[PDB]
């Protein structure tokens, strides 16, 4: 890391708070951070010749909190990429005052890959032929995306240094999902057609149809079963899935942990059903989105190849190949028409989520062996058990808890996709889990006070 310090000391850093910021002020700073992120999401880049082409990275716009043709086109890619690069370098033993140097290195690597990602996005023909834009326009777009990625990194540091209530990744993903749901609920954008004005928001459309149309029953049924714009059934399904995920996320196994090193601090260690909070969903969505974008690029460039055809076949939704069986069915009638695809999708979702959950407990350090080591270090024992049988109890509970939590969160995603809820299964599950993380932070701060 000694060859990188001069370049590690040239980027801005957030100073740690002297005191411990109160919960109210941390909420205010989280609101300010998400406001800045949204405002930048709504501001287009300069130099855009045309955005008529289909978005190649349309499937990453939810897991990366991105927005095409704007200052947060790359979304939270700086944070995610810097974290993964630093973790991979730690695995390769290359990477290792130490905290400040580590943060500087992660910022520098994230910004380098932000430049690379801006180059890739420009060269994808997203904004037009790069030859037609020219070196000046491409460089301006790269500079804007570079500075925006710097701002994203600074906002994540603001959140994670004690000014905010978490990480930029979760906050921005949940913010974009909630924005999408509220937009589909309350959009004033009217879509004129043969009938007339039709607000793109379901509730505004309901009010408009009730106020204008003479046949009130026809207006209600239309507003509930629109097939061109958001439904009211879609919001009803979104609320129902919200409630179900909220119910299933409060499940926990309460271990009565006692203390041996220091006596008289009887407590409870909760092993949640959702042991890995939305990590299976994040991993599954990242896998499927990367497969989707790779298949779309391969179909665009290398069309007619056998391996490309089996990888995916697009119309832009997949119609055949691996990417088709990895896609939620369009509706329940689609499930009825093709049951084999529905079964394959359900099995893939459940199995992938369960596998990702167990792999993540084995990787992130929440395995039963790791929890037993934590108990030994803190001198904690189970109330009705021994100190040598703690690992056996954790092996009974935690692995099954992680596997079934992944299974249940995948099942909830499948249910939300089948119900046609606004924001799909990934969006709803991610939003609910992130808001529950924020609620857990709130209750932890209250218990501390």
């Amino acid at each position: 890391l000694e060859v990188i310090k001069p370049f590690c000391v040239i980027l801005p850093e957030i100073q740690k708070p002297e005191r411990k910021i109160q919960f109210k002020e941390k909420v205010l700073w989280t609101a300010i951070t998400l406001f800045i992120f949204l405002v930048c999401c709504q501001i287009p880049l300069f130099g855009i010749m045309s955005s008529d082409s289909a978005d190649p990275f349309y499937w990453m716009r939810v897991i990366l909190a991105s927005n095409r043709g704007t200052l947060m086109e790359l979304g939270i890619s700086p944070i995610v990429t810097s974290g993964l690069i630093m973790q991979l370098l730690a695995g390769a033993k290359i990477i290792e005052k130490d905290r400040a140097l580590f943060n500087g290195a992660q910022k520098l690597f994230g910004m380098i890959i932000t430049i690379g990602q801006s180059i890739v996005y420009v060269m994808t023909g997203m904004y037009g032929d790069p030859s037609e834009m020219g070196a000046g326009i491409c460089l301006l777009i790269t500079i804007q995306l570079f500075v925006a990625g710097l701002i994203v990194l600074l906002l994540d540091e603001l959140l994670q240094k004690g000014y905010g209530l978490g990480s930029g990744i979760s906050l921005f993903i949940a913010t974009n999902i909630c924005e999408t749901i509220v937009w589909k609920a309350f959009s004033p954008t009217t879509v004129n057609t043969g009938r007339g004005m039709e607000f793109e928001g379901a509730i505004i459309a309901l009010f408009h149809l009730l106020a204008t149309r003479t046949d009130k029953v026809r207006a209600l049924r239309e507003a509930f079963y629109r097939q061109n714009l958001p439904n009211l059934m879609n919001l009803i399904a979104t609320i129902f899935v919200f409630a179900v995920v909220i119910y299933f996320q409060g499940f926990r196994y309460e271990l009565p942990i006692r203390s041996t090193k220091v006596r008289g601090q009887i407590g409870i260690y909760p092993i949640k059903l959702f042991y890995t909070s939305n990590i299976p969903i994040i991993l599954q969505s990242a896998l499927v989105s990367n497969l989707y974008v790779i298949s779309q690029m391969l179909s665009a460039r290398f069309s007619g190849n056998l391996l490309v055809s089996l990888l995916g076949t697009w119309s832009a939704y997949p119609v055949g190949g691996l990417c088709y069986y990895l896609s939620p069915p369009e509706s329940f009638g689609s499930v009825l028409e093709d049951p084999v695809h529905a079964v394959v999708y359900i099995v893939f979702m459940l199995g992938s989520c369960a596998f990702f959950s167990k792999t993540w407990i084995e990787v992130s350090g929440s395995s039963p062996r790791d929890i037993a080591k934590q108990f030994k270090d803190q001198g904690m024992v189970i109330n009705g058990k021994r100190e040598t049988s703690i690992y056996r109890e954790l092996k009974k509970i935690i692995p099954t808890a992680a596997a079934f939590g992944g299974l249940c969160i995948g099942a909830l995603s499948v249910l939300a996709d089948f119900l046609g809820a606004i924001g799909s299964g990934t969006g709803i599950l991610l939003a609910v889990t992130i808001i529950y993380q924020y609620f857990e932070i709130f209750v932890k701060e209250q218990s501390e006070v």
Partner: protein, 31 residues
């Protein structure tokens, strides 16, 4: 290294936003 606070971060984000807006305005006037 530079150790900015949260308010400087907000101000610099607003300044980048304003810079993009002025880029758009300058291009609009030039065209």
């Amino acid at each position: 290294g530079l150790k900015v606070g949260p308010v400087p971060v907000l101000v610099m984000s607003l300044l980048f936003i304003a810079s993009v807006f002025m880029l758009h305005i300058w291009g609009k006037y030039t065209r």
